[PDB]
Amino acid sequence: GSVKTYMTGFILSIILTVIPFWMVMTGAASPAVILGTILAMAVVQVLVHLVCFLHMNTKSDEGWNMTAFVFTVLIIAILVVGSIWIMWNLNYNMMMH
């Protein structure tokens, strides 16, 4: 039943946390692969916690409770990436060139 859905979301979340922690502590001989694997496993572990824990579904509130999350992801991606790109150009400028 639903007991196995919580356990599968619990086993995978352990694997998606030890392996990002193991590469930083060991060193893994490559800083670019570490940053790729940390950001990739962070997104997947979020998607595990949405399906297995929060029980997100398209057929939940007659199409809602899923498109509200998709809209707010786009708002966050507008706010975070947009302000970082604005502040990067403001910090690249205003320097003693």
Binding site: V3, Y6, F10, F21, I38, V46, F53
Partner: protein
């Protein structure tokens, strides 16, 4: 009836997710805002954050077993699975306080090296939500023990089930950006 408050609380968590994203945008600008103070590698002890990640992870599977027991008709099993996840929630708070107390005594508080100001405003703001969820869990534990698994009590468990699992999703984004990227 009961599904209106559950959906209405989900919209609030979407506003709360935007609320946490402003702190992530503020922290990302002030990563290199160390005014001669310690950086991320000089502060972050990754064995100490690995225990904190597992304590919040153990408190999400424990609440998941409480929601399964709510779908059953066992009154005592909902209380017993709620007492265990309160201890894991208190252990997460008890390690963030100990991490914050070590920095303030050693002179690495928010009033020096304003990268540390953004560090205290993101981990501390996440720690306030877990502290707010701990009071909500403690209030809910005394209503189920007194009135039982009524129709209004079943809605408040599911509203906290959305809230408590959301704080683990934010903590995934917290330890990725702050601790893992900062202490490479």
């Amino acid at each position: 009836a009961g599904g209106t408050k559950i959906f209405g609380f989900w919209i609030y968590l979407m506003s709360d997710c935007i609320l946490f994203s402003i702190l992530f945008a503020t922290y990302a600008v002030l990563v290199n805002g160390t005014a001669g103070g310690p950086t991320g590698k000089d502060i972050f002890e990754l064995p100490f954050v690995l225990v904190e990640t597992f304590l919040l992870l153990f408190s999400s599977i424990t609440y998941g077993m409480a929601a399964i027991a709510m779908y059953k008709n066992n009154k005592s099993q909902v209380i017993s699975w709620l007492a265990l996840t309160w201890l894991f929630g208190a252990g997460f708070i008890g390690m963030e306080i100990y991490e914050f107390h070590h920095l303030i005594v050693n002179g690495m508080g928010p009033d020096r090296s304003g990268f540390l100001s953004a560090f205290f405003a993101l981990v501390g703001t996440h720690g306030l939500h877990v502290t707010s969820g701990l009071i909500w869990m403690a209030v809910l534990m005394v209503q189920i023990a007194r009135r039982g698994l009524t129709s209004t009590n079943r809605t408040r468990i599911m509203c906290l089930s959305l809230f408590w699992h959301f704080l683990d999703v934010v903590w995934i984004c917290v330890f990725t950006v702050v601790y893992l990227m900062g202490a490479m």
